[PDB]
Amino acid sequence: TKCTLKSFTVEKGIYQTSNFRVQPTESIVRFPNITNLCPFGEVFNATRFASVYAWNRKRISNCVADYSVLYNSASFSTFKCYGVSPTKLNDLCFTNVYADSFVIRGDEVRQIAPGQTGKIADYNYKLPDDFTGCVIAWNSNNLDSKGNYNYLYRKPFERDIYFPLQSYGFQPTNVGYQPYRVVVLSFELLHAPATVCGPKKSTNLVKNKCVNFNFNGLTGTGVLTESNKKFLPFQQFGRDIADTTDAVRDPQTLEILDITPCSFGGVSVITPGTNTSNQVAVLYQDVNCTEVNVFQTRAGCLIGAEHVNNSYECDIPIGAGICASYQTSQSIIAYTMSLGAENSVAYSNNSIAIPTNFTISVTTEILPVSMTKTSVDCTMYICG
Amino acid sequence: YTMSLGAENSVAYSNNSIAIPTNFTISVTTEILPVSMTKTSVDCTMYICGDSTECSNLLLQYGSFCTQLNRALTGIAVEQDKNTQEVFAQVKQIYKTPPIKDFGGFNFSQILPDPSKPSKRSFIEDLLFNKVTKFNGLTVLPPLLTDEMIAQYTSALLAGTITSGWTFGAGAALQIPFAMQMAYRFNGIGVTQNVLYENQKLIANQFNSAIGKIQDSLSSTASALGKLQDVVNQNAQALNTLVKQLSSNFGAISSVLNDILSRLDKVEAEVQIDRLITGRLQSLQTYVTQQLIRAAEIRASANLAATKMSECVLGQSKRVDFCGKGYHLMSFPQSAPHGVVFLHVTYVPAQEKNFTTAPAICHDGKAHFPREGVFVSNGTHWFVTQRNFYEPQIITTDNTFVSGNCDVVIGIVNNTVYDP
Amino acid sequence: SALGKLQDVVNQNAQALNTLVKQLSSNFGAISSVLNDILSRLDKVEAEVQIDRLITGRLQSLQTYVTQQLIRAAEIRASANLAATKMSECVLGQSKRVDFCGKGYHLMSFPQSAPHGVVFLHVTYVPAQEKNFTTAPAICHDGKAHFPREGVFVSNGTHWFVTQRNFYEPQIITTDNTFVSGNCDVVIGIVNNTVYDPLQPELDS
Amino acid sequence: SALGKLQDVVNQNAQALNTLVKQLSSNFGAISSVLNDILSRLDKVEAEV
Ligand SMILES: *[C@@H]1O[C@H](CO)[C@@H](O[C@@H]2O[C@H](CO)[C@@H](O)[C@H](O)[C@H]2NC(C)=O)[C@H](O)[C@H]1NC(C)=O
Ligand SMILES: *[C@@H]1O[C@H](CO)[C@@H](O[C@@H]2O[C@H](CO)[C@@H](O)[C@H](O)[C@H]2NC(C)=O)[C@H](O)[C@H]1NC(C)=O
Ligand SMILES: *[C@@H]1O[C@H](CO)[C@@H](O[C@@H]2O[C@H](CO)[C@@H](O)[C@H](O)[C@H]2NC(C)=O)[C@H](O)[C@H]1NC(C)=O
Ligand SMILES: *[C@@H]1O[C@H](CO)[C@@H](O[C@@H]2O[C@H](CO)[C@@H](O)[C@H](O)[C@H]2NC(C)=O)[C@H](O)[C@H]1NC(C)=O
Ligand SMILES: *[C@@H]1O[C@H](CO)[C@@H](O[C@@H]2O[C@H](CO)[C@@H](O)[C@H](O)[C@H]2NC(C)=O)[C@H](O)[C@H]1NC(C)=O
Ligand SMILES: *[C@@H]1O[C@H](CO)[C@@H](O[C@@H]2O[C@H](CO)[C@@H](O)[C@H](O)[C@H]2NC(C)=O)[C@H](O)[C@H]1NC(C)=O
Ligand SMILES: *[C@@H]1O[C@H](CO)[C@@H](O[C@@H]2O[C@H](CO)[C@@H](O)[C@H](O)[C@H]2NC(C)=O)[C@H](O)[C@H]1NC(C)=O
Ligand SMILES: *[C@@H]1O[C@H](CO)[C@@H](O)[C@H](O)[C@H]1NC(C)=O
Ligand SMILES: *[C@@H]1O[C@H](CO)[C@@H](O)[C@H](O)[C@H]1NC(C)=O
Ligand SMILES: *[C@@H]1O[C@H](CO)[C@@H](O)[C@H](O)[C@H]1NC(C)=O
Ligand SMILES: *[C@@H]1O[C@H](CO)[C@@H](O)[C@H](O)[C@H]1NC(C)=O
Ligand SMILES: *[C@@H]1O[C@H](CO)[C@@H](O)[C@H](O)[C@H]1NC(C)=O
Ligand SMILES: *[C@@H]1O[C@H](CO)[C@@H](O)[C@H](O)[C@H]1NC(C)=O
Ligand SMILES: *[C@@H]1O[C@H](CO)[C@@H](O)[C@H](O)[C@H]1NC(C)=O
Ligand SMILES: *[C@@H]1O[C@H](CO)[C@@H](O)[C@H](O)[C@H]1NC(C)=O
Ligand SMILES: *[C@@H]1O[C@H](CO)[C@@H](O)[C@H](O)[C@H]1NC(C)=O
């Protein structure tokens, strides 16, 4: 409370200080149960790469991808990744991965990016502007040079198989005019079943307990529970209005789990003034007395306040007809607020009460009329 | 089509014609007022960052924006209890109604509590309660007064009003028979109190029937509560707009913060997360600004409802059209979800006749003027009568006062004035 | 604590200004909250990227302050319009409006000034020592129903009086205190008592 | 000068609309205040910034 108010004195009242949040008890990792190592050797160590006018696409699926074996290979002159960072790839997984394999001149690697331009990007190898993937390249002048005029150059991922055709004199003595191999990996993140996943090992599943989960790279925290949601066969995830995932299908056992965020609420602290007592009571807002001088109000579980069967004027307001006060031997007490003294007016069809005397009361009413006329020199405030 | 402004009417004016109403109708009119709105509170760190520690650390760089949003929503939430307290808690004691309902023929049973209920609302308060109908850190706090406490305040206001008139607002409740309370309420509109006691069954039947018509309206017609349902709909639309804005990218690679944190490493992720922090923080500042302006509109309505409680329920109002159309007699409060409903009872004059009229009467060369009321003629004889109800009295030195001779007054007429 | 409304208005404006000053210590994502660090550490092309984060955050901080001061100024104006209405109706007049000029029947109000506000000392009549009486709407005499011109019929248990509503002063019932309207049979709860004619003993003497 | 309250309400709304239109001439840190300069001078990746 003192830290919330940035003050060492706290005046009498109720203060929303802080947030109660049940913590993840353990971490849960769910990935498909498949163990084939992905055929990246048949991509990167192929005998000859294709010409860029007629590049080859290898589908990678139903396998485990150890991407650090690629990223750590000092032979790669670039490993630029776009919608993902190469360090994260082992934690994360995809429905498919597609590897595009071809040779280009070493000057031309700069054209192979989302939204880049130049004749190879314009004619024969175009990337999407919203591409998710990695572009990987290395000098192959030791292997693809001879020159080797078999290497020939001319929408996104369209194979465009005098006219716009040219070919390369790749020779070992060439520096820009040297051959480079390129692999472009495209990652299919879409909400189907994953089939190309990192080496990260699956745990067992846990239900009805708060956990730090990961399904197919979908990280989160929540209470996992069995659910009645009829996911159609093509659907792996279900979403909230806020886009946050609301339910999932387990990748090893195809059953549907609800995700519920772990129990949370505002922590209101009820205090007399610190210049009266250092005792306090705590209201866990909306929470029931289970996840947390204990009393379930309709405002939440109230702890450290003594429930009293009397009623008094509302001293500190808690909510839903409940108030608290500091009273005598002292404690904080919590009670239903009194609306006023009850009175049966002595009515009958022929009785009247007439006042035989008066009192001249003087009552004081206080009204705000003005406030401090501030003026801020916004250029001196902003720029000093 | 071009809209009609109303039916056209040539008022039958001439320099010596007056219309005086020979009969009345006791109108009961229903006024519905918003008083409070849903006490939302938003945990701005959980809205913006969703328990990401990575985002929560970036959100500290924005300083006290998050704590002043929580402060502004807390100020709005606290004034909803203040607004509700100022309207209903105008009564110092919880007055209760006698076991015998000897109110001179008037029948409040449809606006008084029923003990049969789980919450002791009246019949009309149950109609009014039936006709009005997340994990992202958004929460709703309960009101301080429960609807059962609001119903004890409207019951106390109503039981005080019935058993004691305005007197329970000015001091202690002084009991008075309800037929005699209404006789004072007739004098308060300038209708002479004998008009009530001579027409008491008729006036009671018109009141009982007018309360019956409130039940028939509120049972059939859900559009009556439109002001309270609008206040519910605006707060629901504002919260749903605030939740839907979490699906927006704001120019980041994803709207979902766990995509950014699972796909990107720290230096790349923090650039994307700052776009989500900027957009989600602008989304809260937009919500809290419109809730501050909406809370000021509800406070203006709660101050109006608190003024109608004091002047219409605890009093009788001379202010034209403040407590419903017609001359105000009295008002009964009924509670409704986030609001109050006043059943404003008013005298409406109802069956005119045209009469010849004069400002003064010449007798013995003296000009006589009415002490109260108007000179009128049926065509052959001259009478003095009260303004708001035709009751013709013979013209006498008791009903009228002299001032000077005849010659000064434009349109004086010659008739005898009887000296008793 | 009597002055709580005026001290609240002082506290809100001080809290708003202190919040506006404290926001100058915020980075808003720049390398420093202090603009002279940026300008001494970084050269122009790099510095202008950092300074635009501070301009954006400080300008948002000012727009937030001015927006809340506009809404707070509208709340103070509503209170000033109310105070101006209490000045006209309670001080310059006497108000029939129930509970407008304090609890009880309003007599008069005196303005006193206070810091950023006004204080009204609302003087009111409060009726204070009741008695219960039997009452009637009208009196039957000679078959005529008599009603009070002003006030109420009451009985001490044996005799009938007419008295004003807000203070017990029992007057003998006479044809000056009361007016006839029609015969007895129409009125629910009429009672039988004589009504004195003040002329009769003057002519009987 | 009698109608000062009504002319003030007209002047405030005109001043607010003229301020809203004049703000279209502001760069806000872009290379131009004019959106067709950006779209004719810069290609997609650079223009969208
Ligand atoms: C896909 O194929 C169509 C032909 O069916 C191509 O359309 C022609 O494009 C050239 C310019 O490149 C035009 O001169 C022709 O008039 C077009 N013909 C027709 C029938 O529209 C189309 O360009 C191809 N797509 C790409 C990206 O090359
Ligand atoms: C007051 O009015 C109510 C209706 O507005 C009367 O209630 C009805 O009373 C009869 C018996 O007399 C019952 O059969 C009905 O079911 C009642 N209706 C409801 C909705 O409760 C009531 O009788 C009237 N009071 C008096 C004393 O006449
Ligand atoms: C004054 O108006 C009322 C209606 O507001 C008249 O009362 C009705 O009279 C008819 C017969 O003419 C009865 O059948 C109805 O039951 C009465 N209604 C009520 C509510 O009692 C009344 O007769 C009129 N009186 C005069 C003198 O015009
Ligand atoms: C105007 O009012 C007077 C008094 O009410 C009427 O005069 C009485 O008329 C009745 C018949 O309707 C006679 O029996 C009475 O003897 C008359 N009394 C007097 C004192 O003359 C008069 O008729 C009314 N005139 C009109 C045009 O309605
Ligand atoms: C009211 O009655 C008086 C008489 O009692 C009328 O006065 C006469 O009016 C005529 C015309 O102006 C004069 O020629 C007479 O000399 C007046 N006589 C007296 C005794 O004054 C008077 O005109 C009548 N008023 C109206 C409005 O008709
Ligand atoms: C009601 O009031 C009347 C008049 O004030 C009281 O009658 C008088 O009572 C006194 C004694 O208290 C006698 O001396 C007078 O002679 C009485 N006057 C008359 C005209 O009878 C009466 O006593 C009061 N009754 C009660 C129950 O208080
Ligand atoms: C007021 O006094 C009259 C008599 O002056 C009472 O009228 C008598 O009432 C009884 C019982 O109903 C009848 O037997 C008589 O025939 C009535 N006499 C007359 C002349 O009408 C009247 O009841 C009294 N009123 C009250 C309210 O007590
Ligand atoms: C390519 O082959 C060499 C051995 O010749 C091996 O060290 C390397 O890991 C292989 N690369 C891939 C991607 O399989
Ligand atoms: C995958 O694992 C689950 C247990 O997690 C098992 O039920 C299922 O039969 C396994 N499928 C295969 C193809 O091994
Ligand atoms: C603070 O506490 C002291 C007793 O320790 C008391 O004398 C003093 O009046 C208190 N002041 C306030 C403002 O409550
Ligand atoms: C609190 O939880 C228990 C079960 O643990 C349940 O029976 C009870 O109804 C709950 N009470 C409230 C007020 O939610
Ligand atoms: C309140 O009173 C009841 C009896 O009326 C008793 O059973 C109960 O234990 C009391 N509760 C507390 C908190 O003292
Ligand atoms: C009064 O007289 C005028 C004469 O034109 C007539 O139009 C009007 O209907 C009359 N009103 C009543 C209530 O008799
Ligand atoms: C009304 O006007 C007529 C002329 O049209 C005039 O003779 C008469 O004296 C006027 N009466 C009043 C009451 O003004
Ligand atoms: C009036 O009489 C009733 C009789 O039950 C009593 O309850 C009430 O307190 C009395 N009031 C006064 C002011 O004497
Ligand atoms: C009051 O009620 C009684 C029956 O309880 C009745 O005899 C009497 O006439 C009524 N008096 C009035 C003033 O209504």
Side-chain angles (χ1 to χ4, degrees):
Chain A
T1 310
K2 287 177 180 183
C3 294
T4 301
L5 304 190
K6 303 290 191 291
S7 180
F8 277 38
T9 290
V10 180
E11 297 78 11
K12 172 165 157 280
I14 182 168
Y15 300 98
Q16 183 162 337
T17 62
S18 188
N19 303 295
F20 171 68
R21 281 179 285 210
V22 175
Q23 298 299 299
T25 306
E26 59 186 296
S27 63
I28 295 296
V29 177
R30 293 268 82 192
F31 282 120
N33 52 339
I34 195 150
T35 59
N36 309 306
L37 295 176
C38 296
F40 292 112
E42 306 195 352
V43 179
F44 287 93
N45 294 336
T47 306
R48 294 296 181 274
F49 272 41
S51 285
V52 68
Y53 96 94
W55 49 271
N56 287 338
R57 188 170 197 104
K58 174 64 178 181
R59 180 180 173 227
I60 298 175
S61 70
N62 290 312
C63 67
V64 176
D66 192 11
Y67 302 96
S68 66
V69 176
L70 311 180
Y71 175 66
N72 297 344
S73 186
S75 58
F76 301 149
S77 310
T78 191
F79 208 99
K80 175 61 180 179
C81 303
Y82 296 89
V84 290
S85 309
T87 53
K88 288 291 190 179
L89 299 177
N90 294 350
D91 192 46
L92 177 68
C93 77
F94 315 115
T95 62
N96 304 286
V97 177
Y98 308 98
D100 301 327
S101 168
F102 53 96
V103 185
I104 50 151
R105 170 176 59 118
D107 300 314
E108 306 189 303
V109 180
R110 188 168 63 97
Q111 302 189 18
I112 304 178
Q116 265 292 0
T117 54
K119 69 182 68 180
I120 279 169
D122 194 14
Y123 292 118
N124 56 195
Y125 190 78
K126 182 72 181 185
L127 289 179
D129 300 316
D130 60 350
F131 173 69
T132 298
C134 298
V135 174
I136 306 163
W138 62 107
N139 190 324
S140 65
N141 193 43
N142 67 315
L143 181 64
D144 297 329
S145 292
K146 288 186 179 185
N148 200 357
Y149 294 107
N150 289 33
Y151 283 105
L152 199 169
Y153 59 104
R154 188 154 284 205
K155 279 180 178 181
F157 306 122
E158 189 197 332
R159 298 180 76 254
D160 189 359
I161 306 302
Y162 182 60
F163 297 107
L165 290 75
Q166 296 95 41
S167 63
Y168 277 127
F170 292 141
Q171 298 182 354
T173 56
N174 284 0
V175 179
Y177 311 103
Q178 291 180 17
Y180 276 58
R181 285 179 181 204
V182 305
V183 178
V184 185
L185 300 181
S186 177
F187 304 130
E188 192 187 338
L189 275 166
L190 301 178
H191 321 92
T195 85
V196 184
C197 300
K200 189 163 180 164
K201 300 181 182 181
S202 54
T203 67
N204 193 18
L205 178 63
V206 164
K207 292 169 179 171
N208 309 297
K209 190 172 69 178
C210 177
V211 292
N212 176 4
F213 64 76
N214 177 341
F215 290 85
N216 310 317
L218 183 87
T219 61
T221 289
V223 183
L224 301 175
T225 65
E226 305 193 340
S227 73
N228 65 356
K229 285 170 182 159
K230 187 190 176 180
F231 280 30
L232 307 180
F234 63 96
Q235 299 169 341
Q236 199 68 20
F237 299 154
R239 287 187 188 284
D240 197 358
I241 308 304
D243 288 349
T244 53
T245 307
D246 181 62
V248 293
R249 182 165 67 186
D250 167 335
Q252 302 203 2
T253 50
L254 304 183
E255 67 191 46
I256 315 305
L257 305 171
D258 277 325
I259 292 156
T260 306
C262 308
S263 190
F264 80 95
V267 179
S268 286
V269 180
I270 293 143
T271 190
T274 51
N275 202 105
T276 286
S277 186
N278 291 292
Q279 187 167 13
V280 297
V282 185
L283 178 79
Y284 295 90
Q285 294 173 11
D286 205 25
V287 174
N288 190 4
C289 299
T290 293
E291 295 98 287
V292 185
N293 296 328
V294 176
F295 173 32
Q296 186 66 31
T297 75
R298 291 186 182 201
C301 187
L302 177 68
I303 301 191
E306 177 173 19
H307 180 228
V308 164
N309 285 333
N310 304 341
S311 59
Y312 312 109
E313 297 188 43
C314 185
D315 195 22
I316 305 166
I318 284 162
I322 305 302
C323 298
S325 68
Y326 185 70
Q327 289 183 214
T328 54
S329 63
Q330 294 172 338
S331 59
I332 295 176
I333 61 159
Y335 56 87
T336 296
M337 63 182 280
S338 181
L339 306 187
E342 187 170 287
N343 182 346
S344 55
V345 185
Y347 180 96
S348 71
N349 71 343
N350 76 348
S351 181
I352 197 176
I354 300 190
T356 69
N357 205 346
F358 53 73
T359 185
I360 302 308
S361 93
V362 181
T363 55
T364 296
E365 178 166 35
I366 294 158
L367 275 153
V369 168
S370 55
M371 65 178 199
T372 304
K373 292 172 60 184
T374 63
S375 176
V376 182
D377 179 22
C378 67
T379 306
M380 181 178 287
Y381 177 79
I382 296 168
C383 291
Chain B
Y1 56 88
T2 296
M3 64 182 281
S4 181
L5 305 188
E8 186 170 290
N9 182 340
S10 55
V11 186
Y13 179 96
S14 72
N15 71 345
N16 77 348
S17 183
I18 197 176
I20 299 190
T22 68
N23 204 347
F24 53 73
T25 185
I26 303 305
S27 185
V28 181
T29 57
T30 296
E31 178 166 35
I32 291 150
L33 275 153
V35 168
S36 55
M37 65 179 199
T38 303
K39 292 171 60 184
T40 64
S41 186
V42 183
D43 179 9
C44 67
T45 297
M46 189 178 198
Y47 178 81
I48 296 167
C49 292
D51 306 338
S52 162
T53 307
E54 309 89 339
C55 178
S56 180
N57 292 341
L58 291 173
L59 181 60
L60 300 184
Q61 301 176 353
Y62 286 83
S64 55
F65 280 136
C66 235
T67 63
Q68 83 193 259
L69 291 164
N70 303 342
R71 192 189 301 144
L73 288 173
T74 301
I76 293 158
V78 170
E79 79 180 319
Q80 306 317 309
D81 296 323
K82 186 182 177 180
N83 290 344
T84 309
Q85 198 80 23
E86 285 178 350
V87 177
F88 294 106
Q90 299 203 5
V91 73
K92 59 160 182 173
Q93 290 193 335
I94 299 304
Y95 298 108
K96 67 178 182 183
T97 307
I100 302 166
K101 306 300 190 284
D102 50 337
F103 305 129
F106 298 77
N107 183 344
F108 310 106
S109 62
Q110 311 302 291
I111 64 167
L112 287 173
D114 180 359
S116 315
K117 310 291 181 169
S119 176
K120 296 175 184 173
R121 289 188 306 236
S122 72
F123 195 117
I124 283 161
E125 285 178 317
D126 273 346
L127 303 181
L128 297 171
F129 267 76
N130 290 353
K131 296 313 185 186
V132 183
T133 62
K134 210 174 186 177
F135 305 101
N136 301 299
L138 284 61
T139 64
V140 172
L141 309 177
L144 174 59
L145 295 175
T146 58
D147 300 316
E148 183 177 345
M149 290 179 164
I150 303 297
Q152 285 165 77
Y153 282 132
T154 60
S155 177
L157 290 157
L158 177 58
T161 302
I162 291 160
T163 57
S164 74
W166 42 68
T167 70
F168 83 100
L174 304 178
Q175 78 274 9
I176 181 173
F178 193 88
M180 296 188 68
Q181 162 171 339
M182 275 285 282
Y184 300 177
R185 303 244 177 192
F186 270 46
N187 285 345
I189 63 166
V191 180
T192 308
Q193 61 180 315
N194 71 294
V195 175
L196 173 67
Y197 303 124
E198 293 173 41
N199 300 286
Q200 188 183 322
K201 294 184 182 181
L202 171 61
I203 290 163
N205 291 351
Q206 287 180 356
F207 175 74
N208 297 349
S209 305
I211 291 291
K213 291 174 182 180
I214 305 316
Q215 295 176 272
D216 297 346
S217 175
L218 294 179
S219 301
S220 60
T221 304
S223 61
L225 282 292
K227 292 183 181 181
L228 271 44
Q229 190 64 57
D230 179 18
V231 168
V232 173
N233 291 357
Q234 285 182 45
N235 282 279
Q237 178 67 299
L239 288 164
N240 293 343
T241 299
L242 182 68
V243 176
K244 284 176 180 183
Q245 278 286 49
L246 294 168
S247 71
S248 301
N249 287 15
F250 306 111
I253 55 151
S254 179
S255 59
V256 177
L257 180 58
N258 296 6
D259 291 351
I260 302 175
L261 290 167
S262 59
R263 292 206 274 132
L264 296 176
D265 210 339
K266 182 176 174 66
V267 174
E268 301 192 274
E270 288 182 351
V271 175
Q272 303 294 329
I273 299 172
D274 196 36
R275 298 180 191 164
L276 293 187
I277 290 168
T278 300
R280 291 176 182 185
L281 184 58
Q282 183 185 13
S283 177
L284 283 168
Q285 284 170 359
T286 302
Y287 171 76
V288 179
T289 298
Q290 293 187 359
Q291 289 297 104
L292 283 169
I293 296 159
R294 184 174 288 123
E297 183 178 13
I298 296 295
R299 182 180 59 249
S301 186
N303 292 348
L304 180 57
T307 306
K308 305 224 178 187
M309 195 73 73
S310 312
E311 299 182 25
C312 311
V313 183
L314 278 67
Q316 180 180 19
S317 196
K318 291 290 295 184
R319 294 173 63 189
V320 172
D321 304 353
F322 190 62
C323 311
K325 190 171 62 70
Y327 310 132
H328 181 240
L329 292 171
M330 62 204 159
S331 303
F332 302 118
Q334 299 287 264
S335 58
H338 305 315
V340 68
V341 180
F342 296 98
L343 312 185
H344 302 297
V345 193
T346 71
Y347 177 105
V348 174
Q351 294 182 326
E352 297 78 21
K353 288 186 184 180
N354 289 331
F355 303 96
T356 295
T357 190
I361 304 296
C362 278
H363 182 62
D364 292 340
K366 293 173 287 185
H368 293 265
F369 306 80
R371 280 187 172 101
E372 288 186 304
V374 199
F375 297 120
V376 292
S377 180
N378 68 355
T380 62
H381 292 70
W382 279 96
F383 304 115
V384 57
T385 195
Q386 64 188 312
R387 308 208 291 239
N388 287 311
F389 185 85
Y390 180 68
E391 182 182 314
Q393 301 149 234
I394 294 292
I395 302 171
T396 72
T397 57
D398 293 344
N399 298 330
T400 63
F401 69 87
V402 175
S403 186
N405 78 81
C406 286
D407 298 347
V408 193
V409 177
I410 297 171
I412 198 156
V413 304
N414 293 352
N415 196 82
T416 56
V417 174
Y418 168 52
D419 189 34
Chain C
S1 61
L3 281 291
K5 289 182 177 181
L6 272 43
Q7 189 64 53
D8 179 19
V9 169
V10 173
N11 291 356
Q12 285 182 45
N13 282 279
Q15 176 69 304
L17 289 163
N18 293 343
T19 300
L20 182 68
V21 176
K22 283 178 178 184
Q23 279 286 49
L24 294 168
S25 71
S26 301
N27 286 52
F28 306 112
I31 56 151
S32 180
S33 58
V34 177
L35 180 57
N36 295 331
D37 290 350
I38 300 172
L39 291 167
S40 57
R41 292 206 276 132
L42 293 172
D43 209 340
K44 296 178 183 175
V45 181
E46 299 189 279
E48 288 182 345
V49 175
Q50 303 295 329
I51 299 173
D52 196 34
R53 299 181 192 164
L54 292 185
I55 289 168
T56 300
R58 290 176 182 184
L59 183 57
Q60 182 186 13
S61 173
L62 244 177
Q63 282 170 359
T64 301
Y65 171 78
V66 179
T67 299
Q68 292 183 357
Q69 289 297 104
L70 283 169
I71 295 157
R72 185 174 289 123
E75 181 178 13
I76 295 293
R77 182 180 59 249
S79 186
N81 292 350
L82 179 57
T85 306
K86 304 237 178 180
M87 195 74 73
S88 312
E89 299 182 26
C90 311
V91 183
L92 278 68
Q94 180 180 19
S95 196
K96 290 290 297 185
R97 294 173 62 189
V98 172
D99 304 352
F100 190 63
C101 311
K103 191 171 62 69
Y105 310 132
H106 181 240
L107 294 174
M108 60 199 167
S109 303
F110 302 118
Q112 299 287 264
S113 58
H116 305 303
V118 68
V119 181
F120 296 98
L121 310 182
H122 302 297
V123 193
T124 70
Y125 177 106
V126 174
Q129 293 183 321
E130 297 78 20
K131 284 184 184 179
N132 288 327
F133 303 96
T134 295
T135 191
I139 304 296
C140 277
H141 181 63
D142 292 341
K144 291 169 285 185
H146 294 265
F147 306 80
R149 281 187 173 100
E150 292 177 295
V152 197
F153 297 120
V154 291
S155 180
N156 69 354
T158 62
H159 293 70
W160 278 96
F161 304 117
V162 58
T163 196
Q164 64 191 314
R165 306 203 294 234
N166 288 308
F167 185 85
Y168 179 69
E169 182 182 315
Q171 302 152 235
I172 294 291
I173 303 172
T174 75
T175 61
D176 293 346
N177 299 331
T178 62
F179 69 86
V180 176
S181 186
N183 78 82
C184 286
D185 298 347
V186 192
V187 177
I188 296 170
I190 197 155
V191 304
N192 294 353
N193 196 84
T194 62
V195 174
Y196 169 50
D197 178 2
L199 180 65
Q200 181 64 6
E202 312 301 345
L203 273 55
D204 192 30
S205 180
Chain D
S1 60
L3 282 291
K5 302 191 194 174
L6 271 43
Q7 189 64 52
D8 178 18
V9 168
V10 173
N11 291 355
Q12 285 182 45
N13 282 279
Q15 176 69 309
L17 289 163
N18 293 343
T19 300
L20 182 69
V21 176
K22 284 175 179 182
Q23 278 286 49
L24 294 168
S25 71
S26 301
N27 286 48
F28 306 112
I31 57 155
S32 180
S33 58
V34 179
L35 181 57
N36 296 330
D37 290 351
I38 293 162
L39 290 166
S40 58
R41 291 205 276 132
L42 295 176
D43 211 338
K44 182 172 173 65
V45 178
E46 300 189 279
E48 288 180 352
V49 176

